[PDB]
Amino acid sequence: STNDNIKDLLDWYSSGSDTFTNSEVLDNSLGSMRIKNTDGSISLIIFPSPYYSPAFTKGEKVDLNTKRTKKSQHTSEGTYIHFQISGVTNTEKLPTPIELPLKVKVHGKDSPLKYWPKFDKKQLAISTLDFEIRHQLTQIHGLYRSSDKTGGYWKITMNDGSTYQSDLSKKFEYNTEKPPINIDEIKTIEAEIN
Ligand SMILES: [Zn+2]
């Protein structure tokens, strides 16, 4: 039925993000960031895309919602080092959480939701919004699990026409993502499969 192009997308998309908060920055280099989460552990986050370079300085308070590109490390010195790609953002939260309008469609007929989260942030990195949608896709809506369901797209459409998108059939092009958006200004999000 399928091939590595799917087995591997099935892996990365079904698993799960990390979600840290009020972490500090231990250094900011070109497309590279070394943070320290509240729990003593430090993270080596990278930033492919030139459009998306975060300029948070040593001392600031950041939030992660990144994903690990490889299993973690334990130095025989007592410090847990993560290896995660993108996600860093600011600690602005909204007074009372909202749930982003998403609507998965499977070849025509409306597909209802099963356990789609309640968001409390203002600025969510597009890496995050991708992982969410596709995560909720590979799980409840069963994507990358059957030959019948190997492709499609999703579409965020803002409260001022701007649009963003991605094609389920390839991993999010991390090397070209634009900065984190205020999720309260999303008119709608969509997803359609096959
Ligand atoms: Zn330890």
UniProtKB/Swiss-Prot annotation:
Just give the chief location class.
Answer: secreted
* Cell compartments where the protein resides: Secreted
Q: Which residues form a coiled coil?
A: none
Under the GO molecular function aspect, what terms does this record hold?
toxin activity
Source organism's superkingdom?
A: Bacteria
A GO CC term attached to the entry: extracellular region
Keywords of the record, alphabetical order, are: Secreted, Signal, Superantigen, Toxin, Virulence
Q: What does this protein do?
A: Responsible for the symptoms of toxic shock syndrome.
The family line of this record is: Belongs to the staphylococcal/streptococcal toxin family.
Q: What is this protein called?
A: Toxic shock syndrome toxin-1
- Classification of source organism: Bacteria, Bacillati, Bacillota, Bacilli, Bacillales
Please state which portion of the whole protein this structure contains, as first and last residue out of the total length.
41 to 234 of 234
